Each structure stands twice: as C-alpha cells, then as structure tokens.
Amino acid sequence: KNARVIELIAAYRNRGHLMADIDPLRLDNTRFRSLTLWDLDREFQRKKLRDILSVLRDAYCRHVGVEYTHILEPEQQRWIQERVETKHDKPTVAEQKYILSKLNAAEAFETFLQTKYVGQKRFSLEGAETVIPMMDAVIDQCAEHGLDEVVIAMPHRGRLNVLANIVGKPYSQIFSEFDVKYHLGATGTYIQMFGDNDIEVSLTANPSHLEAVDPVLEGLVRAKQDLLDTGEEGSDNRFSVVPLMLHGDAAFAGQGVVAETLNLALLRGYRTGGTIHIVVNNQIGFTTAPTDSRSSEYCTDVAKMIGAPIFHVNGDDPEACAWVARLAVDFRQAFKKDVVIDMLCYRRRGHNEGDDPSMTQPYMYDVIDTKRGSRKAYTEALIGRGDISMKEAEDALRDYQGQLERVFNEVRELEKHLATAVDKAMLQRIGDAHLALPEGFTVHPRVRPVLEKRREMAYEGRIDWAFAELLALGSLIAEGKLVRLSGQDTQRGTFTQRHAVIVDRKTGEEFTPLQLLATNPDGTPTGGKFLVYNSALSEFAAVGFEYGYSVGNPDAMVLWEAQFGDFVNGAQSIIDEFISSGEAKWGQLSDVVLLLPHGHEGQGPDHTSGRIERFLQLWAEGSMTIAMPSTPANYFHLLRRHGKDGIQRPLIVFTPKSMLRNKAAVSDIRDFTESKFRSVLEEPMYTDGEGDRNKVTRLLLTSGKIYYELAARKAKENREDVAIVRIEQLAPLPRRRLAETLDRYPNVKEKFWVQEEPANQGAWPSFGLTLPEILPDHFTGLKRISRRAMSAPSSGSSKVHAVEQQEILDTAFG
Amino acid sequence: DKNARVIELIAAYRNRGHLMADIDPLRLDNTRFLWDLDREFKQRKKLRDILSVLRDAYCRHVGVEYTHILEPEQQRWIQERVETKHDKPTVAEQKYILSKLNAAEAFETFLQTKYVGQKRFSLEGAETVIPMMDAVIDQCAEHGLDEVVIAMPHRGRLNVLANIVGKPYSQIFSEFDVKYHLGATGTYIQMFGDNDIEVSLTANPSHLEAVDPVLEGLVRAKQDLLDTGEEGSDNRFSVVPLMLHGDAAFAGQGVVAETLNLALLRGYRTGGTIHIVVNNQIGFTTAPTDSRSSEYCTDVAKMIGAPIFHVNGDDPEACAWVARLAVDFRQAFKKDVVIDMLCYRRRGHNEGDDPSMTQPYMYDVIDTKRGSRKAYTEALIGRGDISMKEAEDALRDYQGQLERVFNEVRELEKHLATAVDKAMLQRIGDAHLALPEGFTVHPRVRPVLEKRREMAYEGRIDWAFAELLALGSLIAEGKLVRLSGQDTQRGTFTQRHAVIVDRKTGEEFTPLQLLATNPDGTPTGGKFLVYNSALSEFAAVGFEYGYSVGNPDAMVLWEAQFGDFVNGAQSIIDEFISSGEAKWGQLSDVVLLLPHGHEGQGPDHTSGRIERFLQLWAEGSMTIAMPSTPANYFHLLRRHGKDGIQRPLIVFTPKSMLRNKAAVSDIRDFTESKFRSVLEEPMYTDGEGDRNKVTRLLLTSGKIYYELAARKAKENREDVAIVRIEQLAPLPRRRLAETLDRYPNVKEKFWVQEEPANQGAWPSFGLTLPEILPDHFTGLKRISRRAMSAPSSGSSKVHAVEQQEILDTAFG
Ligand SMILES: CCOP(=O)(O)[C@@](O)(CCC(=O)O)[C@H]1SC(CCOP(=O)(O)OP(=O)(O)O)=C(C)N1Cc1cnc(C)nc1N
Ligand SMILES: CCOP(=O)(O)[C@@](O)(CCC(=O)O)[C@H]1SC(CCOP(=O)(O)OP(=O)(O)O)=C(C)N1Cc1cnc(C)nc1N
Ligand SMILES: [Ca+2]
Ligand SMILES: [Ca+2]
Ligand SMILES: [Mg+2]
Numbered sequence A: 001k002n003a004r005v006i007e008l009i010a011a012y013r014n015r016g017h018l019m020a021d022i023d024p025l026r027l028d029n030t031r032f033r034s035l036t037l038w039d040l041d042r043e044f045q046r047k048k049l050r051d052i053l054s055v056l057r058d059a060y061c062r063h064v065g066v067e068y069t070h071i072l073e074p075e076q077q078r079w080i081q082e083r084v085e086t087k088h089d090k091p092t093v094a095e096q097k098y099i100l101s102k103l104n105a106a107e108a109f110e111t112f113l114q115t116k117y118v119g120q121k122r123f124s125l126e127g128a129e130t131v132i133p134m135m136d137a138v139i140d141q142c143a144e145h146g147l148d149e150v151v152i153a154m155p156h157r158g159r160l161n162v163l164a165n166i167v168g169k170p171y172s173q174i175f176s177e178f179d180v181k182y183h184l185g186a187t188g189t190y191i192q193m194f195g196d197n198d199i200e201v202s203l204t205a206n207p208s209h210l211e212a213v214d215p216v217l218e219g220l221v222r223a224k225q226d227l228l229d230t231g232e233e234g235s236d237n238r239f240s241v242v243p244l245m246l247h248g249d250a251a252f253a254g255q256g257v258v259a260e261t262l263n264l265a266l267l268r269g270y271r272t273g274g275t276i277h278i279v280v281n282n283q284i285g286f287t288t289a290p291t292d293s294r295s296s297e298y299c300t301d302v303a304k305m306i307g308a309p310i311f312h313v314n315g316d317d318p319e320a321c322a323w324v325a326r327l328a329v330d331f332r333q334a335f336k337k338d339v340v341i342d343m344l345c346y347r348r349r350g351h352n353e354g355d356d357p358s359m360t361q362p363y364m365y366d367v368i369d370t371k372r373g374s375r376k377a378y379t380e381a382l383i384g385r386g387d388i389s390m391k392e393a394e395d396a397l398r399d400y401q402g403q404l405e406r407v408f409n410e411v412r413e414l415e416k417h418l419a420t421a422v423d424k425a426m427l428q429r430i431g432d433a434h435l436a437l438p439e440g441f442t443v444h445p446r447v448r449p450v451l452e453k454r455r456e457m458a459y460e461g462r463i464d465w466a467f468a469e470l471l472a473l474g475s476l477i478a479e480g481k482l483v484r485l486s487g488q489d490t491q492r493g494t495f496t497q498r499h500a501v502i503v504d505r506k507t508g509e510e511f512t513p514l515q516l517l518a519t520n521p522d523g524t525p526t527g528g529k530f531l532v533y534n535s536a537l538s539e540f541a542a543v544g545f546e547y548g549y550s551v552g553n554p555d556a557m558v559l560w561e562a563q564f565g566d567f568v569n570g571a572q573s574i575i576d577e578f579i580s581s582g583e584a585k586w587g588q589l590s591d592v593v594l595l596l597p598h599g600h601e602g603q604g605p606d607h608t609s610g611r612i613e614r615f616l617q618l619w620a621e622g623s624m625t626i627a628m629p630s631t632p633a634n635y636f637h638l639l640r641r642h643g644k645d646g647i648q649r650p651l652i653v654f655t656p657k658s659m660l661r662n663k664a665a666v667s668d669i670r671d672f673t674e675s676k677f678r679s680v681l682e683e684p685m686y687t688d689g690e691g692d693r694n695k696v697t698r699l700l701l702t703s704g705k706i707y708y709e710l711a712a713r714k715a716k717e718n719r720e721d722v723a724i725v726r727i728e729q730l731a732p733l734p735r736r737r738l739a740e741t742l743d744r745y746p747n748v749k750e751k752f753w754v755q756e757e758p759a760n761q762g763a764w765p766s767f768g769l770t771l772p773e774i775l776p777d778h779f780t781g782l783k784r785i786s787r788r789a790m791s792a793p794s795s796g797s798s799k800v801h802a803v804e805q806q807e808i809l810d811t812a813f814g
Numbered sequence B: 001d002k003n004a005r006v007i008e009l010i011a012a013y014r015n016r017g018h019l020m021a022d023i024d025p026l027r028l029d030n031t032r033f034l035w036d037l038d039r040e041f042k043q044r045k046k047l048r049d050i051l052s053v054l055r056d057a058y059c060r061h062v063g064v065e066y067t068h069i070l071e072p073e074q075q076r077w078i079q080e081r082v083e084t085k086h087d088k089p090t091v092a093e094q095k096y097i098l099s100k101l102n103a104a105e106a107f108e109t110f111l112q113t114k115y116v117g118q119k120r121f122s123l124e125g126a127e128t129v130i131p132m133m134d135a136v137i138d139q140c141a142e143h144g145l146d147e148v149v150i151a152m153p154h155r156g157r158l159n160v161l162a163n164i165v166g167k168p169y170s171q172i173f174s175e176f177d178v179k180y181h182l183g184a185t186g187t188y189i190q191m192f193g194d195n196d197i198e199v200s201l202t203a204n205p206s207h208l209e210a211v212d213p214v215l216e217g218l219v220r221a222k223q224d225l226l227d228t229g230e231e232g233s234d235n236r237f238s239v240v241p242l243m244l245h246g247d248a249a250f251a252g253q254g255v256v257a258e259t260l261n262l263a264l265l266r267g268y269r270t271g272g273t274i275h276i277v278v279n280n281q282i283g284f285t286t287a288p289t290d291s292r293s294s295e296y297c298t299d300v301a302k303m304i305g306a307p308i309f310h311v312n313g314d315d316p317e318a319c320a321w322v323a324r325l326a327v328d329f330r331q332a333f334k335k336d337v338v339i340d341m342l343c344y345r346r347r348g349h350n351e352g353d354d355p356s357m358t359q360p361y362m363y364d365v366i367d368t369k370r371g372s373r374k375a376y377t378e379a380l381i382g383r384g385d386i387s388m389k390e391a392e393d394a395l396r397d398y399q400g401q402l403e404r405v406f407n408e409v410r411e412l413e414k415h416l417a418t419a420v421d422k423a424m425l426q427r428i429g430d431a432h433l434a435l436p437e438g439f440t441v442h443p444r445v446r447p448v449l450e451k452r453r454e455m456a457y458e459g460r461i462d463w464a465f466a467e468l469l470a471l472g473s474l475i476a477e478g479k480l481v482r483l484s485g486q487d488t489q490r491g492t493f494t495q496r497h498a499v500i501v502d503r504k505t506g507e508e509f510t511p512l513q514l515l516a517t518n519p520d521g522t523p524t525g526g527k528f529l530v531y532n533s534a535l536s537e538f539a540a541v542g543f544e545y546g547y548s549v550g551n552p553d554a555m556v557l558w559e560a561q562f563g564d565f566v567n568g569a570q571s572i573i574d575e576f577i578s579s580g581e582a583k584w585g586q587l588s589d590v591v592l593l594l595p596h597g598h599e600g601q602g603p604d605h606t607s608g609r610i611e612r613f614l615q616l617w618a619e620g621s622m623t624i625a626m627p628s629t630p631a632n633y634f635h636l637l638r639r640h641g642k643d644g645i646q647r648p649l650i651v652f653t654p655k656s657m658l659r660n661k662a663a664v665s666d667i668r669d670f671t672e673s674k675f676r677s678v679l680e681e682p683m684y685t686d687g688e689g690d691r692n693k694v695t696r697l698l699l700t701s702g703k704i705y706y707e708l709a710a711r712k713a714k715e716n717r718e719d720v721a722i723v724r725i726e727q728l729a730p731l732p733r734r735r736l737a738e739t740l741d742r743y744p745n746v747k748e749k750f751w752v753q754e755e756p757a758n759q760g761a762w763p764s765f766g767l768t769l770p771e772i773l774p775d776h777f778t779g780l781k782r783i784s785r786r787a788m789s790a791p792s793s794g795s796s797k798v799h800a801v802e803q804q805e806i807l808d809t810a811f812g
C-alpha cells in the first residue's frame, strides 16, 4: 500500500499535466474522461493520503500543467516541486486589481485599434490579452531581482499593445503619421507599481519571417551583457540583461531556427543566462489545426532538447499566468537556463480581413463565439470568489471605459497637430605576444613554428594572410576595441592557419596570444578584449547571433566566419532580412563582418563559392561593403578601416583557401606601416618596378587569387602588351580610382573582365551591366573571360576544373 | 520502508540509469562512474536478482531513454524487452558480426593505403556502424518489408556501398569525389533467413542534414506507389527511411527539428525513421561542449517522444541487438527511433589535421585504442565463444578480404498537346457540386462552387479555377497529383478551396478526387493528395523535392505562403532543385508556386526574388515562368506534367490579380490553344489593332500588363504595344524574335517591371537580351523602381507613388 502511494506521487509529477485544465476552449472532450477510499485517512515527513493527493491535484491538475521530470539536474527538479507542491498565498486585492487594470488596458487597446483604424484584424491580441499581465509580471520580477534590462523579441500579434502597455511608449509616438511600426525597435523604462526599482525595456526590430529574430535577440542581449560586465564574460554571474522571447504555437514547432537558438542556451560563446519564452498558443496557425502543424503533444516540446522546464497555463486564469511568469524569472535567476511558458488561449477573430475562420475550423469558432473575454471572465471570477464588490467591479468597468477614452482622445489630439597604418613597434608587439607563453605552458610541436614564424614576419616582413588578419585584430584590441570572432573551428582555423587560441599539449589549457594586447606596456588596460570562439554546427543561428551582437554593441568589431562560403546559404533569411536590408527598412544599423572562404581549386560545388553574385545582387548604395582582397596588407587595412571608420555597415569578405600559403601572396612591413586600403591595385612592376604602362594594349580586370596565375603567365611569356588590374572592393564600385588607374594605360585597345566563376556567377552578372554604364568611356566594349554558365558553382571533378582553369589563362593571353 | 526503497531504486534505474551506463569506448569522463540482497521482494524475486536485471538492462553498454515517452504502452513495450534475460547470440551470428567487421576494416586500410586524399571519409573507430546497419536491414527483411532507403553524410559512404548496398568494387572504383554524393541501388539477401529486401542510397550535397527531409519525401513517394502507409491499403509502411548523422550536425542543424516535426503528420509521415548517429564525440576540431547545450547529441529527438538508445560502439553485439529492437519498435508504433552509437575518429578530420593540436587528451587515449575488430576478436576468445584456430581463421578472413579489394581494383585498372475537351471542363465544374449525401457547405464556400460550374460551361474562368482545371484533367488522365504548402487546402487568399469542410461535422470533401473515377465507374489510376503543411519552408520544400525524385510520374507542387518566405529553403533550392541534375544525374519535376507582386504590403509580402532563380538558371536546369492569364497557367501546368521531362518548374503566382476581372479566360483558350511563352495584346491577334502604327514597344511580365493595357486604352495609344514574356527561363528566343518582327516601325524598346532595378528580370534580361537577339534588343532601356536593398518600401503610400511613376514613364 505504501509503495502504490510513491508511484501515485510520481504519476502526478510526471503526467499530471495531461489532466490539467489548461485549454480555455475545452475542445478535447476526451481529456478528463480518460490504494482505496479507506486509505485516504491513513498516514504515509508523515502526511495523510487525502492531504498528499490534494497537494498533487492543486499543483499539477488545475490551471497549470508542469513539465519538469525530464530535467537531468536533481537540484532543479527539487527546486520546482518545492515551489509548486505548497499552499500558495492568495494575491492581495491590490495585486488582483492591478492584474485587472493590465487586462483593462489590453482589451481597451484592441477595441480602439479595431474600431478606429482599417485593416488591423491581423494584429489582434483578442482572446490572448492575458499575455499583457503575464509579460508585466516577467519584467516586474526582473526589476525585483535588481536586473538592468529586458529585451523582447516577438512576432506582430499584440505588438503595439506591447509598445503601449509593456514598453510604455506614449500613443502620440505610436500612432504618429499612421505597418512598418509592427517591425521597428523601441526603448523605454518600466517603473514598479508596488516596488521601488525600475528597469529598461526594449523591443528589437524584426522581419515578417517568424522566429528568424530568435538568435538575433540572443546576440543583442549577449553584447549588452558583455558591455555591463555581467555573465559569461563578466565579473558577476547575474546575467543582468534578460531575453524575453514571444512566439506563436505553429511557428515555435515548425521553424528549425528555434532548435538552433535553444542549442546556444548554455554554450560559453553564446549563453545569455537563460531566456524567458512565452508562446501565445491560440491553438491555430492561420487555417491550420495543431494536428497538421506538429508531431508532438505540445507546441513547446522542442524545448525538452535542453531540459528546460515547461509550464502550460490557462490563458483565462490571469493569476496563474502572473504566478508562472514570476516563478520562471526565479528559475532563470537560480539556474541560468531557459524557461518556457505555453499560454493556452484563442484567436477571437479571423487571422485577417478575408478570413471567416468557420470555413476551415467550424467547431473551434462555434465555441469561440460563446466565449466572453479574459477581462470579463476575471471580473466575474473575482466577484464570485468574494474578492471584489459590485462597486469595485463597476469601478473596474469605469477604469476600462476611461482607458478606452484616453487612447481615443490622445490620438484625436495627435491627428489635429581615417588612417589605418600602424607603427612597426605595433607589429613587433603582436609578433612577440605569440611567444609570450604562460609559465610551464607546453606548445604542440606543429604549432610552435607558426608562433616563431609570426615573430619573424613581424620584424622581417613576408607577412602572410593569416598573420595580417591577427595584426589587424590585435592592433584594434591595443587601441581599446572589443573584438568578437567566431565560426566553425575558428579558434584554430579550418585551414590550420589561424591558431587564435593554442592548447597546452599536456593539460588542454587554452592560451590566447592576442588577449595580451588588451594590456598596455605600462600594465594598464587598453579597454580592448579578444572574444574568440568555436561555434556550434549552425549557420542560421550563428549568423543571426553575430548580426544581433553588432546591433547590441555598435563599438564592437564582430566577425563571423563560414567554414566555406558555400554554407552561408544556410543563413539566407538573416542575410536577406537583417544584414542586407535592416538599415533601409528599420533604421537599424549593423557593422557585422562575414568572412567567406572562396575560390576555384577543384574541391567541388560545395567547397568553391560564397556566391559573390548573390551579395552583389542584394547590394544597393550604402547598404554593405563587399570585398575580395588579393594581398595580406590590403586585408589588414580593410579590417582596420571597417573598425575605425565610424560607419555602421556590414562587410562581406571573400577570403582565401590555398592562397593563404601562396608564397607570392605575402606583404612587406611598409605595406602595413606606410599605406592604406587600396580599392584598386596595379601590378608592382608599374608602381615599384621598371614596367612600361604605354606598351599595354590588352587590359585584364580581375579580383582575387586568379591574379597570381595571370601574373605568373605574363612573366613566363614576358607579355609587356598585357596588364592585370585588380578590383579589391567589389561594392561600392571604386568608380574614381578605377577611372584614374585605367587613364594610365593610354594604348589599351581591348578590356576583359577575367574570373574563375561561371558566366552567370561571380562579379560578371553585375559588373557586365554596371561598368559600361558608370564608366562608358572606359568600359564600352568590355568582354568576359570565365567558366561557362553552370547550374552549380563548379564541376564535381578536380580534373574538369584544372582543364577549365588552364582554358581561362589561355583565353586571357590568346 | 525497505520494500518501498526497492520501488524507488527500480524507477531510478529506469529514469536515470543511462547516465551511469558504460557507453563511451574512450572513457574520457573520469567522473561519470549488503544483507538485503538475498531477501525476496514483491512475482517474488531476490533483491540481487532484481538489481542485476536493472544493471544489465540500464547500466551496461546500452543507455536507454524512454521514460519521457507519453504513451504508457510504448514505455511498457521497451521495459519488457530490455528487463529480461536475453539469449546470447549463436557462434554463427557472432562470426557473422565479426565477418562484417573484417570487411569494414579491410576496406578502410585499402582506401587509406591505395588512394591519396581519402582521410576525411575514414570510418576507423566507427566500423561497428556496418554490422549495426546490416542488423537494421536484416530485421526489416525479417518483417517482410519492401525496401530500406538510406541518407547519410560522406563518412564511411563507400564502405556502406560495398558492405551494405552490396555494390561491387568494379562499379565503386570505376573512373576514380562525386562518388561520395551519388545515389545507389541494390538488393540485400539475408544470411540466415530466406527473405531479400531492396537497399538504396539517396544523393546529397556537402550541407550536413539538408538531405533529411528529402529522404522522408522520397520514402513517402515510394510508400504511396506501393499502396502502403498513410495513403495506402495496409499499415506496414514497408519502405523504411534509415537516416545517418554526425553528432555535431545532429545537434546544431535546425532542419533536424523540422524533419522530426514531420514524423507523425498525415501529409508527411513515413511510419517511423531509424536514426543512427555516428557519435565520435567530435566535430572537426570542436568538442561537444561547444556544439550543444544538452547532455546528448540526440536530445532534439525528445521533441516527438522518440526512444533513444546510447550504445557503446566497441560492443558490436549490443549495437546489433539495439538495431533489431529499433526496427521492432518502429514496426509496432510507426514512430522514430534514435540510435546514438558512441565511437571515436581514429585519424584526423582531413589531410592537414594533426588532431592532437586541438584535442590532445582525446587523441592520446585514441592512440592507445585498438580497433573494434581486434577488440571483438579478443573478447570472443576471453568469453570462450571462439577457439585459437577460429580466431586465427577470422584473422585470415580479414587478410582475404584485404587482398580481394586490392586484386579486384587492380583487375579494374587494367581494363504534346495540352488542350482538353469542353466536356472535361464541365466535368471538373460539376464535381464542385457533386457533394456527398447530407454534406453542409459553409455559406461563403457554396457561391465559389456554383461559380465554378458556371465558369466551366460559360467561360470567364479565373486563375484559381484554371489551376484546378489543370490538376483535375491530369487526375482524369491517370496522373497522381500532390499539392501542399501553408494553408494550401483553402488557399492563403481564400481562392482555392481544394478541400471544403462540413459546417456541422468538420468532415473534409475533396471535389477533384471524383476525377480519379471515370464516368463508367472504373479508376483512372489518378489521385489528388492535398495537404496543409507545417509552418516550415526548409523541410517542406526538401520533402516535395524528395517526393518528385521518389515518383517521377507524380505531379508535385509546393506552395509558399508568399514567395518572400522561400529564402527559408535556400539550401534546398541551391543544393538540390537547381543543381541536382548536373551534379548527380538526379532528376526532379518539382513545382514551386511563389505568390509574387508589388501591392504595397511591404518587403516580406512582395517578392519571390525572380532575379535569384534567374541567376541560378543554366540551360535546361529549370523552367521559370510568370503567367498573366488563367489559361496560360493551366497550359503551363499541363505541359509540365505531360512533357516527359524531369525538370523543376518555378512559377511566380498572383495575389490581387486572382480577383482582377480583366485577368479571366475564355473556354476556347483551354480547348483550342497551348502554352504561349510570349503573349501579344488581344487587339492584334483577335481584334482590329494595327501593329504598323506602333513606334514604342514595352516588354513586360506579370500583372503590370493589366495596368499598362488600361493606360493605353485610356489615352488611345495606337503608337504603343505591350508584349509579355510568360516564360522567363529558358528565354523563348524564337517566338520573341518572330513576335517583334511583326512591329516594323518600332523606334524604341523598354523592359518594364515593378521590381527595383537590381531585382526582377532586368539584371539578367538587360545583359542577356542584347546578346541573344542583337538586331532586336540593342539599345534596350529599363523602366522599373530604383535599386533597393529590400524587395520594396515599407509604405503602401510610397508604393502607390512609385507604381504611378512607372506607368507615367512608360507613356511619357
Ligand atoms: C496571410 C498569411 O500570412 P501573414 O498573416 O501575413 C504572416 O506573414 C504574419 C507575420 C508578419 O507578416 O509579420 C504569417 S502568420 C502565419 C501563421 C502563424 O501561426 P502561429 O505561429 O501559430 O502564430 P498566430 O496563430 O499568432 O498567427 C504564417 C504562416 N505567416 C507567413 C509566414 C510563413 N513562414 C514564415 C517563416 N514566416 C511567416 N511570416
Ligand atoms: C574542412 C571541414 O569541412 P568538410 O570536412 O569539408 C565538410 O564539408 C564535410 C562534408 C562534405 O563536404 O561532404 C563538413 S564536416 C564538419 C564537421 C562535422 O561534424 P559531425 O557532424 O560531428 O560529423 P563527423 O564527426 O563525422 O565529421 C563540418 C562543419 N563541415 C562543413 C559544413 C558546415 N555546415 C554544413 C551545413 N555542412 C557542412 N558540410
Ligand atoms: Ca564600421
Ligand atoms: Ca515534366
Ligand atoms: Mg497560433
């Protein structure tokens, strides 16, 4: 008999959520319908069975469905049951009236929005108003913990309601020159009603693409946490900036970026100390029923991936919703992990204007038509329970009416009215740092020559690409800049060229040479920092995160590196919806850098191209900088210009692979100490050598590593009649520098754009159309030399590649 | 007290025993690991006997996760098969497992000894996946199933071809890196049984996990052909997806969650996938602590309550046993099973990798490791299962296989009308009113059904009905039609109503499904499969691509809510749809329907990015179209389904043009016409218009035609002509040249478009048209919106000014 009690306790803890009264529509008519009575007064801590069962039913089978026994941490399971399996204190009339006032503000906003403006039906929060007192309780609990800020990310349902009743934006600013308003960022201050603290509340900008903003929010919060010296890269472990992420039930279950973002939750390079998730679960996805949207019992079942606790709550019980919200903030503060709140509600109206939702969901909408709103339900529940009087309930209807009048009145009143060069001592210092090993550190035998070669390069020259990159980042850290670098295997580098972090051969202890540059020679800090990480095997969440990080800290140098440029198409929604277009659409600026290893080397269609043609197609004046440098020094100056120009604009860099080790692709010390970024490059024989530009009759215009192959061929045949000009900055086109460079070759009879990429790829589709228009006296008659148009970036054969590469070189000198 | 402590101990082993199980063959984590024993407890058994059953079941070389499963019958099924004294395998079964290890290791030695640059394809340290996969396929043949279809990354691929798919070495090493991405097909013959089963391998790009929904789609198409599964007569789901993964990719790629989310959906279920994660506890140079935020790489599978089995890759018997249990669970509950095989990567990730640079501790333990073949040969001696002579013979079975592959490869080196009759239209029209007895139509759906009967007999056929006329007529001709996308049954713009819902019961009725039956009552062989998809682009597009590969005879259409969200499926468009044919010889006839058009609804409700599909295009890879009339769309779909060519079709479809009263077609356009790649104004082909009066030619595509035609009619501009390019790719060079030759007095030609200057057809047409037709398009100018970093403005007011500005420039 005593063992059957233990199994009964576990059954309520494990599966009680399946019998909880969480659906305010009660659609499932089989949910509830599918030891002895003398054992109830027997004692089994010693408590009677009737008392054990009453605690279990109240905790697990009322308006809150708790999912927590999947959590592997026993201390976390114990923490939840200790707060859930107790007789809770009923809220004070003041707290209940405050919750009612929030529901009054929410429903008064939705009534106005629908009655005053046209085409607002799709933004309607009606049937889900309880999310306003729930979000209020989240932010108020964060202020109770003395935290610094809450950053919200959400889809567009109830967004202006959130702006007015959560962010605290006035109606004069919200409805000023009144649909882009449902995607813009906002910032405000939350002041506690019954407390003495305040907290910053901000809402991040987003596209229509549901859940795409999820990793953006995380990066943005992480950047703010790093600035406030809180969290993983902070002195305290408070993680004082809280991500509050809102979702829809269909989108939460169907979008892969949800799993990718949850996968970042505890990573040292990406953790934000736990996200508070709120799913506005109105049990519908436009016309689609949940049975066609997911293969699991709950829309939130993906969150079990990271062992997050889940609370299914009845959206018609605003007190249970406010209680769960506060418990969620307390759990996040105690364990630095994600908490998911699944708010079960309904969508009162159609999804949009042309929707009669009884066409596709006739049963759901026969039940929703008999439903009276949450505000009215809660007013009636408070009257029944004896908590408020008739006068008090009527006064709450007087508060509703007043809030409805104020928004109609306020809106009525509103309608009536730079050098990038460094000193040789800076290069030497970055070189010396690679040998300034901690006491007793063991370098791996194959890493030691790289360190010694870097000291040699810093003092003697022949600086390679990999070191030039670290010279740029190291000099920025020495000047006080925060640098964040990440990507797949970025600490070592895909091509074993970086070694930004080196690992002790015997202990596994990490050493970061560039971090020594954050301290001045006198011993004082520079204000700079080097944050280098290996990313998860993700493109979409990682690129979203880095974009978000640069928005969070405009003063940070943020670089994301693709393993190969070919895999960046996995992050196309971020490129399309945030990076390339956020500035023009929302006034949101980002200085994020994307490093894309690019080049035809015979390694196949997924190890050859970062799709230059796609970034060039996305480009429009001042949206991005797109470059393909051919020398280490020009790359060094490109990164330093980007970090010091005071302009917030993304930089797309097509980076080398075998050209990292090309002995001709090296730079002299003077190229770093007495030069600047060169958008257009001539051959050294004309600028430093004894070459004669007047002998040139054929001009080859190119970009990237093919330059070295063209230069080698010219040198082999002694072709003084051919000159090779490189376009280092692909976008914006360096019109003036290009014109001035070409004017130095007066006897040119023919001009050719030479590229490795197929004819429908690389720079030709845009340059072939743009160059003859922007410079008609220079490029009228411009012809193309490249691979044939292909449906893939290249051939699968390294043999077919080698024949095509030779064909390009032979055509250019034919 | 003592008896209740036993119940709590049993639950602890069932729930958390997997945390203490000896699953890691490297034992990296050095912190992961009596009088009541002879007393009998309640069945009556001694505590020592209860506890030994729990330790053997949950804390040996198999870590079982199943108490997260919400179905009590599934928890009970696992419990019963895991908590029993299992029969030890026969010497014949053990020697067979050893023979599979011998073949797999010899292959690896040969591959690393003979050829150069093969390091990254090495399965060394992970060879036990070969007897594990063998057990999966053998258990599927024991159930009498029809086929096992495999999807995997490139590690161990050529080993899988030779020792699983059964391909000979002469076919594998013929003209010997594209071989690590091609599809393959073979027959598996049972060693100790009398059944055989088909085994196939699907093609894939380098993008890890991108093939996951493609495999599901391919399998579902084969299941529908065999009349098995969700759309079948039997519930056997006799085509089994076997999906292999890596541990870093399984945890980090979102497409994994998206594909798992399809596992039980009526439109996407394949009756359960067998998942095998080759968990070598590393991703190139990255440790699991930088790859995931959970205890196991397989924790995502808990999303659909899938049972998970963590198995020690150095124990080939536990691996084979778990594989067979997984197939039995999939057969019993038609649900996914995940096998997490813990192993190691013996060598570097590739040529330039000394793995001890980044993982020095792991690789010092790996360097002391002897392979699972040598280990299992030794374990059989220790157990007394095999003799010295048997162990020596097994070592000479290894040597023989090693010789055979070197010798066989040595020996290798030495050597159509789309028009329908009026009766067909009338029949599809009549079907919309042929309601089942007692069916209640929603009051707003009834006029749609009555207007379709009217359109079928009287004309003025709109876009939405023209689509159903094309699909219906294909079903009547015996074709299988699969249509899906977000809210596709009704249509995003409430225009389709492919499925109608009973107002009082909620019962679904599919009017086009009546066309699957001939007037005499016999079946046509056709079928209409229409579904609402999950809120996914990547998995759904991958699935539909896979479905067309699985059934080349099927008409497969995927519909975006708005073309603006198809960029969420960019990896599928880039790696499969646009390039699969040229890269792998793999053909697909998948259709993508992308609602497109500038209407002032913002940058995410305006464009399907025409310019991107046109940039991806290369001769004969895809067909790209933007029809302006219902009849031309009807003929486009009918040509695509009847041309006998397996090529993807990209269609930019309307939104407000669905209800444009000028955008309607006559019955004769369906009964006495064909697809027209280039369209002239009806005043010149049927009316009294004079082509010789024309001095300005406006070339365009899509709905802007109607706005340009209305302006021409308003001002009576006989000097202007509007020519539409309906087929954007391949460019209809011949018909375009012939059409323009009919306007001899043209002095100026303009490409007119709604899209910004860097978007739409202009970036490609502006460069291509003057080159392919120099005598017609030299001097071709552009009329469009300015170049923009987004597909449009956020303002409907800015949109309206820009739209008017385009029309004014075209007639200025
Ligand atoms: C006409 C249908 O499309 P739409 O209404 O214009 C829209 O795009 C809305 C979002 C926006 O545009 O900002 C949305 S609303 C919606 C249903 C959402 O379901 P749920 O997640 O349960 O949220 P809800 O129940 O609260 O709605 C889809 C599929 N739409 C299109 C869509 C598709 N795919 C992606 C990735 N993002 C999208 N915005
Ligand atoms: C030089 C590193 O890149 P690469 O080796 O060329 C390659 O592309 C390989 C696959 C292929 O190209 O076919 C792979 S192998 C690999 C590590 C995989 O780890 P796991 O999932 O644990 O599997 P494993 O341990 O069995 O390897 C990555 C990140 N590479 C690049 C890559 C990135 N992102 C995506 C979506 N797909 C990829 N192929
Ligand atoms: Ca900048
Ligand atoms: Ca076809
Ligand atoms: Mg919803």
Ligand SMILES: [Mg+2]
Binding pocket: B246, B247, B248, B278, B279, B280, B281, B282, B283, B284
């Ligand atoms: Mg791995």
